Amino acid sequence: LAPGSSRVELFKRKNSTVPFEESNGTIRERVVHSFRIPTIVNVDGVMVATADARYETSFDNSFIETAVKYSVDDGATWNTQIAIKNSRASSVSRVMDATVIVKGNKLYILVGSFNKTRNSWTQHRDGSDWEPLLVVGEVTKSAANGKTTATISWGKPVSLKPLFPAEFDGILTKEFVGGVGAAIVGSNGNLVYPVQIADMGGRVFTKIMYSEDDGNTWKFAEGRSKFGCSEPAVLEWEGKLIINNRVDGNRRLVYESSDMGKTWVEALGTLSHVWTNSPTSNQQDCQSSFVAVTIEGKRVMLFTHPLNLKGRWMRDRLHLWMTDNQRIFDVGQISIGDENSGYSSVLYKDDKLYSLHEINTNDVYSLVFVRFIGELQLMKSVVRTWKEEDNHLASICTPVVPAGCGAAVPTAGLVGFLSHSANGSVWEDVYRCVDANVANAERVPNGLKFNGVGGGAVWPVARQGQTRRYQFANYRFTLVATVTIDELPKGTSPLLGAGLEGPGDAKLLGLSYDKNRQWRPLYGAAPASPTGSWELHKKYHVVLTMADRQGSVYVDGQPLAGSGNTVVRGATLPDISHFYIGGPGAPTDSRVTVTNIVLYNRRLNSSEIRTLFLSQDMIGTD
Ligand SMILES: *[C@@H]1O[C@H](CO)[C@@H](O)[C@H](O)[C@H]1NC(C)=O
Ligand SMILES: *[C@@H]1O[C@H](CO)[C@@H](O)[C@H](O)[C@H]1NC(C)=O
Ligand SMILES: *[C@@H]1O[C@H](CO)[C@@H](O)[C@H](O)[C@H]1NC(C)=O
Ligand SMILES: *[C@@H]1O[C@H](CO)[C@@H](O)[C@H](O)[C@H]1NC(C)=O
Ligand SMILES: *[C@@H]1O[C@H](CO)[C@@H](O)[C@H](O)[C@H]1NC(C)=O
């Protein structure tokens, strides 16, 4: 948790009481073992915190009801209710795993309802013990002489089981449940629930379930995730749904849909596979909140997830990340120390940031309500850096080309930039997300001159480790740089490129230079053959382009021979380890100077490339 921030144990295990309604109408304040599966939203000015009240144990297959606490004063005071009762059919009847949408003064809560099974939903023989319940709550804010008040009234649950198809694409269905957490109203006003479906064979997958009529009718859109995806979270970004999935035992898959879920496309060029379940990716995953907000005038996405360094369900070290779909910033750790956390929720309201999330000691759970003061401070500062650098680059007057200013310096898809700030061991991302590691370097305007064994910089890709923010490059990238060759090499020496994980010294795409003053572009595993001519100490503009498994290398805005060649074979995505600049076993000593290294998450077109070539003395940070 950041300095300056703080929290309270709002739903306190074996302590906080909820108004249990006995079968005869009588109401008793009953203690609750664990409070799990939180969501905190904002309804017309009132904070609403929704959660599972697991009365007797933290287990999934036990007696559970949906609790709510709400507040009209930003958390100085809360009222408590049980918003959805379970069926009371057996000692394990439960309503659970709330997914929530806020529209106007209304809340739509979808929960899974179970009567008497003792095993988990994906393991059921059929769907006979199960019902997906939709519940509508309505917020009414009055007040009085100087003090606002509020009530929330909860409707009777409605079963959506009759709307569930028996098959999808021939897949026989068994059960479905909301993806957990806060979902959305689309800009077109649709109610949008990401849902998780279990088929008869116990496979899990996700889909979009939505309403164009404020919840009167619902439709299952045609698309879906791969099998293995669960607890999906969704938000809307630039006219598309982004569906961020839990994936136990592997990296998190993210999809985009431009047609209200009818068709899904893996977000390979942005967010898919960036996040995961643990350092090694082979552990059970955890729910994440994924929410779009506007900070300092800019739309960004917030994502929460544990590092889970302990593994299994411990889910320690809950982090918060912020992304504009290009840069990905780790705001930091919001849980405390090495405590076990778990499921979470984040909410930006009246320019204040909060979280409601689990804490777990010995599998007894509480929900803490957190005021992210320091986090928001850091968020605003980085949003300001992003806006300011983008506006500055977009405002440069570039040379008009023969057919007051030419095309703008491209900023769409601009992910990272290494320019003037640097020291002998770190080259700073102007965008403050991913720095490069440096050795044997001395500073020059807008970059670094390398001299010494291993002189160069490593801009980590897979080397980022657990969270892989440059994962997009395995699908497509543009890497740009301005270089001079300072001293002739003995034979061949590296200048710039994308190296690969694995045995060997392999590259996906790159450029080297040789003792005959020729270029040596590297296209995948093919033998380099020299081409062209350069001169010592002359400035060259270099651009590497990778898309559709193809690579091109440009010098001075013109492609070198071999460009357009296939750089990888097969269906498996490349696994880039890093980008190298200079020559970071063999005692490589590349005597070069490189400035203004720019990284894009897409293949720049030919005229964009020319714009960068013509404006290279204009983009540096100084
Ligand atoms: C519940 O927690 C509060 C806050 O610390 C404490 O005052 C109270 O003693 C607790 N009640 C129980 C049952 O221990
Ligand atoms: C309703 O049932 C509960 C269960 O014990 C009991 O405590 C309560 O007093 C009952 N009230 C009435 C009016 O029968
Ligand atoms: C669960 O039990 C309740 C109460 O008896 C009943 O109304 C409901 O239909 C049952 N649900 C299912 C899935 O049959
Ligand atoms: C170098 O500066 C970077 C930021 O430029 C910083 O992380 C580090 O403390 C500095 N010292 C080193 C490692 O040379
Ligand atoms: C390349 O992109 C620029 C900026 O996106 C665009 O205006 C232009 O039409 C594109 N040119 C080509 C070669 O299609």
Determine the Cα–Cα distance for residues 298 and 45; give it in Å rounded to an integer: 22
What's phi and psi for 317, nearest 5 deg? 60, 65
DSSP E strands, 146-289: 149-154, 158-159, 167-168, 171-178, 181-182, 184-185, 191-199, 204-211, 219-220, 229-237, 240-247, 254-257, 265-266
Give the largest Cα separation in the chain, rounded.
93
- Quote the CA–CA distance of 233 and 99 in Å, as a whole number: 9
Report yes or no: 129 and 106 within 8 Å, Cβ to Cβ: no
Q: Which of 255, 233, 257 is nearest to 100 (CA)?
A: 233
* Both structure tokens of 275: 């996040």
- CA–centroid distance, 21 to ligand 2, in Å, is 10
> CA nearest 160: which of 112, 199, 231?
112
User: Do β-strands 181-182 and 94-103 pair in parallel, antiparallel, or remain unpaired?
Assistant: parallel
Token digits of residue 425: 């061991």
- Single out the residue of 597, 583, 586, 540 nearest to residue 451, CA to CA: 583
Q: For 390, phi and psi rounded to 5 degrees?
A: -65, -40
Q: Whose CA is nearest to atom 5 of ligand 3?
A: 89
Distance CA 468, CA 540 (A): 31
Instruction: Give residue for tokens 């190298």.
Output: 580
Ligand 2 centroid – CA 132 distance (Å): 30
Rounded Cα distance, 425 and 438, in Å: 4
* Phi, psi dihedral angles at 394 (to 5 degrees): -70, -15
How far apart are alpha carbons 489 and 583 in whole angstroms?
Answer: 12
Q: Which domains does the chain have, with CATH numbers?
A: 1-383 (2.120.10.10), 408-606 (2.60.120.200)
Q: Give me 118's structure tokens.
A: 């003792």
Ligand nearest to the CA of 17: 1
Q: Please tell me the number of Cα atoms within 13 Å of 197 on its side-chain side.
A: 26
Contact at 8 Å (CB) between 471 and 272?
Answer: yes
Contact (CB, 8 A) for 554 and 560: yes
| Resolution given for this structure, in angstroms | 2.2
3-state secondary structure of 133: strand
Amino acid identity of 183? A
| DSSP assigned state of 520 | E
Per DSSP bridges, beta strands 477-485 and 592-600 are antiparallel
Q: Name residues contacting ligand 4 (CB within 6 A).
A: 421, 423-426, 428
Backbone angles phi, psi at 35, to 5 degrees: -115, 120
Helix, strand, coil percent values for the chain (each to nearest 5): 5, 45, 45
Q: CA 354 to CA 376: how far, in whole Å?
A: 9
Which class for 87: exposed (0-12), middle (13-18), buried (19 or more C-beta within 10 A)?
Answer: middle
Give residue 115 CA to ligand 3 midpoint distance, Å: 6
- CA 578 – CA 479 distance, rounded (Å): 12
The ligand placed nearest to the CA atom of residue 31 is 1
Show the tokens assigned to 337: 């120390």
Do residues 529 and 601 touch, judged by C-beta distance below 8 A? Answer: no
Residue 81 near residue 20 (C-beta atoms within 8 A)? no
CA distance 211 to 206: 17
Name which residue sits closest to atom 12 of ligand 1, judged by CA: 15
- Which ligand is in closest contact with the Cα of 23? 2
- Report yes or no: 432 and 382 within 8 Å, Cβ to Cβ: yes
Nearest-CA neighbor of 376 among 338, 325, 322, 297?
322
Q: Number of helices and strands (H, E) in the chain? A: 2, 46
Among the listed residues 68, 85, 215, the one whose alpha carbon sits nearest the alpha carbon of residue 150: 68
Report whether 47 contacts 40 (CB < 8 A): yes
Among 525, 522, 533, smallest CA distance to 562 is for 522
Q: What's the gap in Å between 294 CA and the centre of ligand 1?
A: 38
- Per the structure block, which two tokens stand in for 272? 């898919």
Are residues 382 and 329 in contact, defined by beta-carbon separation less than 8 angstroms?
Answer: yes
Check: CB of residue 521 under 8 Å from CB of residue 511. yes
- Enumerate residues 6+ apart whose C-beta is below 8 A from 470: 415, 416, 434, 459, 460, 461, 464, 576, 599
Which experimental method was this entry solved with?
X-ray
* Displacement of CA 50 from its chain's centroid (Å): 23
What residues are in contact with ligand 3 under a 6 Å CB criterion? 87, 89, 115, 129-131
Q: Which residues contact 337 (CB under 8 A, 6 or more apart)?
A: none
Residue type (1 letter), 247: V
State how far the alpha carbon of 609 is from the alpha carbons of 321, 391, 542, in Å.
Answer: 31, 19, 10
